[PDB]
UniProtKB/Swiss-Prot annotation, chains A, B:
Any single Gene Ontology cellular-component annotation: cytosol
Name of this chain's protein: T-cell leukemia/lymphoma protein 1A
Function: Enhances the phosphorylation and activation of AKT1, AKT2 and AKT3. Promotes nuclear translocation of AKT1. Enhances cell proliferation, stabilizes mitochondrial membrane potential and promotes cell survival.
Localization in the cell: Cytoplasm; Nucleus; Microsome; Endoplasmic reticulum
Gene transcribed to yield this protein: TCL1A
Statement: the UniProt record of this protein carries the keyword Acyltransferase: no
Record annotation: effect of changing I71V: Greatly reduced binding to AKT2. Abolishes nuclear transport of AKT1
Pfam families (alphabetical): TCL1_MTCP1
InterPro entries: TCL1_MTCP1, TCL1_MTCP1_sf
Species for this entry: Homo sapiens
Keywords recorded for this protein, A-Z: Chromosomal rearrangement, Cytoplasm, Endoplasmic reticulum, Microsome, Nucleus, Proto-oncogene
Effect of Q43R: Slightly increased binding to AKT2
Subunit structure: Homodimer. Interacts with AKT1, AKT2 and AKT3 (via PH domain). Interacts with PNPT1; the interaction has no effect on PNPT1 exonuclease activity.
Tissues where the protein occurs: Restricted in the T-cell lineage to immature thymocytes and activated peripheral lymphocytes. Preferentially expressed early in T- and B-lymphocyte differentiation.
Amino acid sequence: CPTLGEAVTDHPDRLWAWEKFVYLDEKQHAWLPLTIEIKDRLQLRVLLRREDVVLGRPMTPTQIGPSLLPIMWQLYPDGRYRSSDSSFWRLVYHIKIDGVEDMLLELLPDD
Amino acid sequence: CPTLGEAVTDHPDRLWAWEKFVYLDEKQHAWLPLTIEIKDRLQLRVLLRREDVVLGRPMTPTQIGPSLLPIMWQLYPDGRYRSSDSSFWRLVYHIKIDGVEDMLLELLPDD
């Protein structure tokens, strides 16, 4: 009756910013950043949720404009994602709850 | 025993970005944006909380860099805040809970 979910082991290998607040992976799956949490005024934690949305033409980095989120995320061999801003993000979790698939990425201060 | 708070009627008239994630008002009070919520991939809702932090020299708009948050918010005669990006934000609420003073601003699509 309460929230009963499970871990997902297949993470997208690439996320492209399609719009300001919509990303698409290699399977043409849309991920929506719903929440951005700021820890110690430095660390960012963004929650992305899978959703079937109606999309047309992708936007350019210019039309998208200034943001806290990268134009693209790329999965590295060590399991972390590299942002197009050259930063590295840790995958805190990737789960599925009653169909709802959520992924939580947290920014790291390395190289 | 549970959360027992109360509304606050004195809202800051100006918020200046001091750092990427720290704002200061006219009373030299620091407000920390803790959460940014994205509604319908368009509307932004940012939660700011008052906190006594140690601050040195303010940063310039350049050092601050790209963001979803404005360099400054200004209280207008109608009770809404005007962002330095020329957008208007509605004050959803301003309360105090066991000392914790929170303010929630939500972006509006007008002029």
